[PDB]
Amino acid sequence: PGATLCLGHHAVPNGTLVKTITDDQIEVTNATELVQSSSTGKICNNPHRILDGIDCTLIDALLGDPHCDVFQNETWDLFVERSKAFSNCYPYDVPDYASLRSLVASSGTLEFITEGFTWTGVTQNGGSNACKRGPGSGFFSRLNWLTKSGSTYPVLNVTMPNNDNFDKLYIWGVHHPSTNQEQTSLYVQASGRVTVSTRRSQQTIIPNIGSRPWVRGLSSRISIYWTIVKPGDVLVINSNGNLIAPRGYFKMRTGKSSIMRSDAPIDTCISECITPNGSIPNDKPFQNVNKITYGACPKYVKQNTLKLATGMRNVPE
Amino acid sequence: PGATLCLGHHAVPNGTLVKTITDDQIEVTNATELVQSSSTGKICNNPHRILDGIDCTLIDALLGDPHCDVFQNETWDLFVERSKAFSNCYPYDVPDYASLRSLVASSGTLEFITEGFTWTGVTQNGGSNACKRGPGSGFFSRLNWLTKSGSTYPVLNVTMPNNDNFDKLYIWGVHHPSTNQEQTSLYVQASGRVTVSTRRSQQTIIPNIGSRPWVRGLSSRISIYWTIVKPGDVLVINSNGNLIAPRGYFKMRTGKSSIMRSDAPIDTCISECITPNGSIPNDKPFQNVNKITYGACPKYVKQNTLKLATGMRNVP
Amino acid sequence: PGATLCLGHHAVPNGTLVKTITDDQIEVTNATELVQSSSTGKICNNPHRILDGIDCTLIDALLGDPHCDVFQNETWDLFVERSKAFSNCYPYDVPDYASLRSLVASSGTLEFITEGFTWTGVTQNGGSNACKRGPGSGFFSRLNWLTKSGSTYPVLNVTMPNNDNFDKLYIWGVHHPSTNQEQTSLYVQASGRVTVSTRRSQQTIIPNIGSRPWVRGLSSRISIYWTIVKPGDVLVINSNGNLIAPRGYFKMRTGKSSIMRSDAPIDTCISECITPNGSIPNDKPFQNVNKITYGACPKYVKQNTLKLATGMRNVP
Amino acid sequence: SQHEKFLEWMLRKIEEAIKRGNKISAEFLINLAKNFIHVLGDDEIRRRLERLERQLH
Amino acid sequence: SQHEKFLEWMLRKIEEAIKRGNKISAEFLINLAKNFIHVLGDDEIRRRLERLERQLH
Amino acid sequence: GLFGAIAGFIENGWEGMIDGWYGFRHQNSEGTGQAADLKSTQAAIDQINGKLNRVIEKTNEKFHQIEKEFSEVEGRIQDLEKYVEDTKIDLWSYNAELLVALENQHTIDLTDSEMNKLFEKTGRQLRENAEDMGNGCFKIYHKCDNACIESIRNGTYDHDVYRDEALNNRF
Amino acid sequence: GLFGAIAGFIENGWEGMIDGWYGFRHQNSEGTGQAADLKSTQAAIDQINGKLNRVIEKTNEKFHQIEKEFSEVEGRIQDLEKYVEDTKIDLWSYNAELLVALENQHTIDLTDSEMNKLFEKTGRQLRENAEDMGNGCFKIYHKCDNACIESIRNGTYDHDVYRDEALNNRFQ
Amino acid sequence: GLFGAIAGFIENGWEGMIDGWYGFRHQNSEGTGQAADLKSTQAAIDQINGKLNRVIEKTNEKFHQIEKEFSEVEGRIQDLEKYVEDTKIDLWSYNAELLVALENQHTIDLTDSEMNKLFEKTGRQLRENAEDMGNGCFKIYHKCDNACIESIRNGTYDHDVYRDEALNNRFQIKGVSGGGGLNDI
Ligand SMILES: *[C@@H]1O[C@H](CO)[C@@H](O[C@@H]2O[C@H](CO)[C@@H](O[C@@H]3O[C@H](CO)[C@@H](O)[C@H](O)[C@@H]3O)[C@H](O)[C@H]2NC(C)=O)[C@H](O)[C@H]1NC(C)=O
Ligand SMILES: *[C@@H]1O[C@H](CO)[C@@H](O[C@@H]2O[C@H](CO)[C@@H](O[C@@H]3O[C@H](CO)[C@@H](O)[C@H](O)[C@@H]3O)[C@H](O)[C@H]2NC(C)=O)[C@H](O)[C@H]1NC(C)=O
Ligand SMILES: *[C@@H]1O[C@H](CO)[C@@H](O[C@@H]2O[C@H](CO)[C@@H](O)[C@H](O)[C@H]2NC(C)=O)[C@H](O)[C@H]1NC(C)=O
Ligand SMILES: *[C@@H]1O[C@H](CO)[C@@H](O[C@@H]2O[C@H](CO)[C@@H](O)[C@H](O)[C@H]2NC(C)=O)[C@H](O)[C@H]1NC(C)=O
Ligand SMILES: *[C@@H]1O[C@H](CO)[C@@H](O[C@@H]2O[C@H](CO)[C@@H](O)[C@H](O)[C@H]2NC(C)=O)[C@H](O)[C@H]1NC(C)=O
Ligand SMILES: *[C@@H]1O[C@H](CO)[C@@H](O[C@@H]2O[C@H](CO)[C@@H](O)[C@H](O)[C@H]2NC(C)=O)[C@H](O)[C@H]1NC(C)=O
Ligand SMILES: *[C@@H]1O[C@H](CO)[C@@H](O[C@@H]2O[C@H](CO)[C@@H](O)[C@H](O)[C@H]2NC(C)=O)[C@H](O)[C@H]1NC(C)=O
Ligand SMILES: *[C@@H]1O[C@H](CO)[C@@H](O)[C@H](O)[C@H]1NC(C)=O
Ligand SMILES: *[C@@H]1O[C@H](CO)[C@@H](O)[C@H](O)[C@H]1NC(C)=O
Ligand SMILES: *[C@@H]1O[C@H](CO)[C@@H](O)[C@H](O)[C@H]1NC(C)=O
Ligand SMILES: *[C@@H]1O[C@H](CO)[C@@H](O)[C@H](O)[C@H]1NC(C)=O
Ligand SMILES: *[C@@H]1O[C@H](CO)[C@@H](O)[C@H](O)[C@H]1NC(C)=O
């Protein structure tokens, strides 16, 4: 006479293997994945404002390449550069290209304010057939090619004060010709010089004459430089030749803006975390998609799978 | 008959909530704070030797700005730069300013030894009104403004050996005038050139003529450059114009010296850890005051509070 | 009419002290060391291909210093630079020396292909008595000293296309004379100019005339520069004086190659991990030998000992 | 009674997980509840669980 | 003798904490000892604890 | 496990248990039966869900960073950028591995602990009316119908009511 | 806790216990009484103090570092410096959070363990003269005055002295 | 330990036990003896070897890196390189210290647990024929020769065979006359 009372736990037919401190593989009833290893392959247009350059790099839209004149006065939270982007204007080079790209991307705006620079004794709006705007020649929309007027090239001394409550970004350039004939024909003097200066900074460039490889029909170059003028300071331009003059300034901003190289398409969805492989969910703590991220993203790790146990040890029959 | 013997544990009226692995807020009997989140607002002058710059930056005291003449031959453990600091001499700029500031701050001394540089055929000790020293014009106390003597500027060629057992820091400059008339009236030649070289390094600067913004009445500038000469090596200065020559060298040292930007007032106390917000105690392993620290400091964290349980579960 | 059955555990006479979360020193029956703190003092020649430079730095062998001629067309996994290394050629300096050294070390090869550069109107194969090859004067094996032919130095304009499927590394130079007489006798023009350009990059160097310290009989210098030409791109050299021309290109590689400064000798053994102190085993996860490592290496830590308990508490 | 109390505390925790943005824990608790609900006996818990499941994705 | 031995060992650990520079642990042990002191019954332990409290950076 | 219940003196689990994580199986004069215990299941679920909430807490939001892929060889600065990114990746990988290992070990240990605690509570309830058979089962030495099993499973069991019969059947 | 004593079969704590962390309450013919057990309190305090000394050990001293605040935009190098500092800060914040969490979990578990160990030690002392009531109290089946309670609380309790009476009172 | 066996109710270890980590010591009518238990020893060794293999798993292989020693003062970039290397070193040192501390604590706790589990298994085996003396020893209330101890040490002990004699020797009222053993046959 009597009864038996047994204590026990549950089990499952198919368990899950997980790692522990002691055992490399141990079977539990259930587990969950902590590493996001897949992406949809499309960048969601929300909540972050995405601006696709299509066939334009950021520097081209900044300078004003003709086929990039659609991104004027534009803003963005993430600018996406494609691999198909091309340059279709005057052959140029930017010493410290990465820094200018980074600062413009972190600013997050291409808002351009035009200023009435006073150019006394020079021909304005010079162009070239390698940078066609419409059927005829053209040039960078935010730059002005100053050349000879009459037969003399005056020593230009122009000033522009910063009386606003925000920083100003000025993009200017120096023209490097291919032969002394071109130099003397366009800028009279045999050797030019450009000096862009503030109260605490100076930048003097001497043009260099020589034949470069043929790019879009030209063996001449343009060197692009930038200058930031703070409130209360003054920009001074002193040039005796080969000046690619600015037309105004860019309003510098500070925020959460950035840039990303990616070839994934842009879709209408919502996702906080974007990678070059596409948008990924932010519910898991880690991710193995790409080390390049933007937004509220899981932390990148080398492991493709990490399973966290959500149940007890699975001891079947 | 019989007796009852009960086991138990203590409890408190007001426990403290802490975080665990399984519970975000669980009540224990007592806990302690592990994050230092407050400062007095003052920098203690001990144990670290604190040198306050007041109105001078480290670079201006290096060059010899007038109102910085007190900082000659000074040493420090932590140099404090204030936000009210201003320059009141010849307008200058330093290419790679950050590196010069950092290396001088890490050296920790402004000990300057004058060397007898022999400048034969030039006018020495030039001055300027933007750098007033007393009743007349002046210049940086550690630099020598060389200009024309008579009507010629020779190719200056001077050598200086380092026969000591330590490194020598030489500060020199290149004058960028504002007009061609100024250039020709000061240095004769239409274009200058400065070349400072050692046995395994060389630096050549070409002056740049042009108008800069008006700073203390002047549109001309000076660019500052440095050169380190090792024991056994030799410094060579070769210039045909616009040379702002060195007057000697600074002795270089290595140690625990640094620099910090802060507006906190200095006080008489002892604290191993200094931040721009003031001196903080180092009893707690972490701190949430400032990521900029100096000395024996708790590590900076983003959390403003982290409570470590020092007692059992409080079960009232 | 009974018996006693006692439970117990083993013990050892001399246990080992370890650290835990709650106790700084507790005795257990056994422990193992997790920090590798000792090295043999020698670099193992396997499995990694070790290239000993003896008396040459990587840059000197790159240029083609005479006593480094044994390093032509050499490959390596780890290049070892010694402290006894010296230069015995034309006195030179490399702007951004560290970057060139790093990129050549990461390429891991000195395979040099000669290209038929056509220099019309100049004298080739110039030499000097500071860069002796045998009893007489010589020059860098990979560089060509171009001077005047007859009494003229034309504007040299040479192009070389990259029609291969790999990158080309070009090393070239610019000669800085000490006097204007030397400049005019070597390159006719009073001031030279060298421009090396690709389709999206360009470099223009203007020589600097002046006296430098006497190194191996000379007060002139050479500045070394490099240019990478991608497949489909073209190298263009345009120079009117002072050009130290390339003789060809170096093939660029990508892989597990690197460089290390060490004075340890090379021995016959197998070890995946090399440090400046020698080869170390990778059995322990951590090491306290040197923060500079190469290969499958334990991670560097500040602790010199970390004991992992492999047994129970030792209770004698 | 007891079963109801278990499922009700579970529903409270699911509501908190939804109201904190933690979706993995919400899914964990929802799956466990979807296996503990005695079909034909607690339709109210089933309906409230479906409602909390909607506020998730 | 048991309570006395406990409190004396407490004082020894406080002295070590002072002689090692660890102040948080010294304050922890000092507060606990000042909570274990049998009010109306012991005074020497209180005096030694006050002396160690004064010697505290 | 540290407590030796799961995969210990308990031989194996019950795949039939579907309404709980821990429970009772009984065999008496009326037959056999099974019923889950909700308290220990609730405790285990609370601990597991708490550690889940702690793990998956959204705490990372980054915007403008550094470049991590490069098309041209540059040297020193690129070396430094690559080294920094590699260091960060390695450190976070180590953190994730150690985290999952520690959390899984603790999960197994706490489930073992909950099982052992339920066993200990049932044993203390039964008092001197039953004996531990060593395999997670109690042999009850008195008449215990379905209502008695229910009173045991919900904590209301009164041992003195059956103490005399149990002692008579035991010794 | 893992051991189920504190917030387990022990219903709640005793706010009247001010001279210890764990202890005994007794009820016998002479009345009621309370006395702390100092060995378990000492063990728990030692573990907590060792944890405290390990955590708060001063091990960080840095001097000349990198700049962490900037007044002008520079680009690549400033981006790298900011990224390095942010990475370091995030890693150390994670380390601190995980450290405090693990330490608190271990503290709760070890205090529960000390309570359970004291309970089991008292039970092994009592042998067959008492029964576990399931609520942290032992029912003793013989007359046990204040001296007997003291003999239990200081480890000198002799079970054989009362075994005959206790067995007579237990089994009917 | 958390379980109070090692350095708890068991006074100390046995330096004589050399063929195992846990075991039994017995004293009966035939004399004294000692024998190791291989199940608990194997389990403890298995867990320790698992954590050891997990810790020392080779997972780091790096090649070309950054420079970490410098011959000339340079400033900003060199400051940044030194700061990066110092940060990495400090973080890895902290990781190593915390790892070894946690692992040693867990090893001590799991060995204590194994001892306690063996003790409880033996007690549940002995059932009502023995009593826990509180110092890791069981007082067995029946005749138990070397074969009986062997049956205990390998799990085959049958309690019902000896239960009657064990109860007869256990529950004795020695104070009353005839409270000992029943001498009727
Ligand atoms: C997300 O996109 C990135 C970028 O495309 C992917 O990383 C890269 O993936 C390619 C393969 O599509 C890798 O190239 C391969 O490398 C191996 C090296 O052993 C080589 O054997 C193959 O022939 C091929 O060239 C590339 O290495 C890799 N880059 C990095 C830095 O990992 C990534 O895989 C994508 N991830 C997902 C989840 O889509
Ligand atoms: C307790 O731990 C210690 C380590 O702290 C163990 O001592 C070492 O054990 C290893 C075996 O794993 C021995 O390695 C052998 O050494 C010989 C001679 O060099 C070599 O030829 C073998 O290939 C192997 O590497 C080692 O000698 C020994 N001693 C030392 C100082 O390392 C010990 O075995 C452990 N004891 C137990 C009971 O686990
Ligand atoms: C928690 O610990 C703190 C330690 O500072 C205790 O605060 C101290 O309490 C003692 C005793 O009353 C006082 O002498 C000190 O002046 C207090 N220090 C303070 C307030 O900074 C606190 O009482 C403890 N809490 C509990 C519940 O025990
Ligand atoms: C230490 O001082 C810094 C300023 O140097 C404080 O940082 C400011 O904090 C406020 C409040 O969060 C912000 O609104 C400002 O934007 C911050 N300024 C900068 C430059 O970061 C910091 O809060 C102070 N910390 C303490 C503990 O006093
Ligand atoms: C490995 O070699 C390094 C040198 O590269 C040694 O580091 C030096 O050690 C000495 C002696 O303590 C110090 O005076 C130097 O300041 C150290 N230099 C550096 C750069 O750290 C290191 O001690 C050697 N280690 C072993 C195990 O031999
Ligand atoms: C482990 O838990 C997960 C929790 O998500 C279970 O997955 C869900 O199971 C329910 C079953 O009612 C499905 O409706 C969901 O769609 C599942 N979600 C996902 C993301 O798959 C999983 O079934 C559990 N595993 C075991 C063996 O119980
Ligand atoms: C432990 O408790 C016992 C209680 O039995 C103490 O023994 C008593 O000690 C007092 C004081 O010396 C005597 O007046 C009593 O007569 C003793 N009672 C008995 C039954 O012997 C004992 O002193 C306590 N301490 C120790 C260390 O054993
Ligand atoms: C851009 O915005 C400014 C300010 O609103 C405006 O003056 C200007 O005309 C706009 N367009 C261009 C091309 O600058
Ligand atoms: C350039 O113009 C500014 C503004 O009037 C003036 O201050 C400066 O002296 C001028 N520079 C010249 C004329 O060289
Ligand atoms: C400059 O002085 C040095 C002194 O050693 C000398 O060697 C060199 O020839 C001098 N140069 C000129 C141009 O006088
Ligand atoms: C280096 O190797 C290449 C292999 O293509 C060969 O053509 C070349 O002649 C070699 N150079 C020397 C100097 O041996
Ligand atoms: C140099 O040669 C290239 C070859 O294509 C040619 O395009 C270029 O015009 C030449 N330059 C000069 C100055 O002759």
Residue numbers in the entry:
A (entry chain E): 9 to 325
B (entry chain A), C (entry chain C): 9 to 324
D (entry chain H), E (entry chain G): 1 to 57
F (entry chain F): 1 to 171
G (entry chain B): 1 to 172
H (entry chain D): 1 to 185
Task: Give the text the authors published on this PDB structure.
The design of proteins that bind to a specific site on the surface of a target protein using no information other than the three-dimensional structure of the target remains a challenge. Here we describe a general solution to this problem that starts with a broad exploration of the vast space of possible binding modes to a selected region of a protein surface, and then intensifies the search in the vicinity of the most promising binding modes. We demonstrate the broad applicability of this approach through the de novo design of binding proteins to 12 diverse protein targets with different shapes and surface properties. Biophysical characterization shows that the binders, which are all smaller than 65 amino acids, are hyperstable and, following experimental optimization, bind their targets with nanomolar to picomolar affinities.
We succeeded in solving crystal structures of five of the binder–target complexes, and all five closely match the corresponding computational design models.
